[PDB]
Design a protein around this ligand. Structure first.
Ligand SMILES: CO[C@H]1CNC[C@@H](OCC2CCC(F)(F)CC2)[C@@H]1Nc1ncc(-c2cncc(C)c2)c2cc(C)c(=O)[nH]c12
Length: 130
């Protein structure tokens, strides 16, 4: 319906705003675009489903997220991929793991403060009716 399309449009606006705020944070530059395969040639082999913030924006625009829960699954994926691909105690690995956890924590904190629970519940109920 018109009510439901308006709901999902608002969801997309909200998700773009959150994602933009993550993307402009200097700490999260490494997560803004897909990896350069010349920098990490084995990434395609090691990481089952790559994810990055530009891909998240594309998915928002393709109407791939019908709830904030679905969106957070991809944010979680960005983080979990980083913990998986960079496991070692070397400072480089520790830096990116810290940034990955910070990205995840920042997204969840923004959502905690700014997402109305009744809006999310409406999204979830529309999604489950399809
Ligand atoms: C197995 O590879 C890792 C070996 N240890 C050092 C790691 O690099 C640490 C950098 C990563 C980039 C930074 F900004 F976060 C600062 C710490 C290695 N891991 C990775 N190395 C390089 C990249 C990368 C990919 N494309 C473009 C650029 C400029 C850099 C990445 C990217 C991702 C997403 C990742 O998880 N690990 C990387």
């Amino acid at each position: 319906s018109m009510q439901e399309e308006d709901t999902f449009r608002e969801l997309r606006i909200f998700l773009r705003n959150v994602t933009h705020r993550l993307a402009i944070d200097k700490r999260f530059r490494v997560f803004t675009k897909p990896v350069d395969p010349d920098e990490v040639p084995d990434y395609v082999t090691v990481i089952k489903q790559p994810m990055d913030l530009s891909s998240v924006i594309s998915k928002i625009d393709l109407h791939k997220y019908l709830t904030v829960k679905d969106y957070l699954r991809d944010i979680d994926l960005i983080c979990s991929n980083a913990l998986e691909y960079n496991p070692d105690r070397d400072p480089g690995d520790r830096l990116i793991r810290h940034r990955a956890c910070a990205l995840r924590d920042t997204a969840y904190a923004i959502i905690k403060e700014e997402l109305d629970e009744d809006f999310e519940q409406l999204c979830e109920e529309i999604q489950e009716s399809r």
